[PDB]
Amino acid sequence: MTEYKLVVVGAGGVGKSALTIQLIQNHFVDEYDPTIEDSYRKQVVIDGETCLLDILDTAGQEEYSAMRDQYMRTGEGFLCVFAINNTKSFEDIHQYREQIKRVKDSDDVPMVLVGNKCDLAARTVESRQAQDLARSYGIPYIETSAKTRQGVEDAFYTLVREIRQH
Numbered sequence: 001m002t003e004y005k006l007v008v009v010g011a012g013g014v015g016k017s018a019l020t021i022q023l024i025q026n027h028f029v030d031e032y033d034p035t036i037e038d039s040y041r042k043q044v045v046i047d048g049e050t051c052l053l054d055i056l057d058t059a060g061q062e063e064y065s066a067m068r069d070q071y072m073r074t075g076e077g078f079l080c081v082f083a084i085n086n087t088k089s090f091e092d093i094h095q096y097r098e099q100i101k102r103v104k105d106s107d108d109v110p111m112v113l114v115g116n117k118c119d120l121a122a123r124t125v126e127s128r129q130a131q132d133l134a135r136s137y138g139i140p141y142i143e144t145s146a147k148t149r150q151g152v153e154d155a156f157y158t159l160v161r162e163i164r165q166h
């Protein structure tokens with residue numbers, strides 16, 4: 001069947017795994033568990049299409065700058081995640097996008113900007129800001145919460161639809 005190779009990238013601790021786990025196991029992981037490299041395969045019916053979501057959950061730590069080129073090269077769609085309460089994670093975003101473009105020799109790669117942890121009150125990154133960024137990249141922006149599950153499916157399915165169009 002149609003497989004979609006999605007990769008979740010972003011700075012450490014922004015909630016890449018939490019998002020993935022919510023989509024897969026439908027439950028919020030509230031524990032410190034740094035990722036080295038994890039893979040998840042889930043069958044889903046999206047817009048009537050039976051497909052396999054092959055998701056690669058990556059590490060936020062730079063010590064693994066090598067494993068990057070590999071998966072970035074084989075990925076079809078990328079969820080670029082940052083946390084709305086971590087300005088730094090928002091700034092690192094462009095670096096991940098740039099690495100993706102250089103590794104694939106393409107300026108138009110299926111991507112979605114995701115502002116996670118939208119359930120917290122101490123927001124340091126204005127929504128219009130991330131949205132302005134997304135607008136310049138020509139990619140969709142979606143705020144999510146792995147805790148309450150808001151936008152979770154929204155983010156993954158939009159990416160999938162972005163892949164269908166390209």
Ligand SMILES: Nc1nc2c(ncn2[C@@H]2O[C@H](COP(=O)(O)OP(=O)(O)NP(=O)(O)O)[C@@H](O)[C@H]2O)c(=O)[nH]1
Nearest residue numbers: 012013014015016017018030035060117145146147
């Ligand atoms: N309040 C709140 N906490 C969240 C949310 N998503 C993740 N967290 C919390 O943030 C911490 C880090 O989440 P985790 O999924 O491990 O982040 P990561 O981006 O995957 N980290 P790493 O890059 O090291 O692999 C955890 O304690 C987790 O519960 C969210 O939407 N809301």
Ligand SMILES: [Mg+2]
Nearest residue numbers: 016017034035
């Ligand atoms: Mg993780």
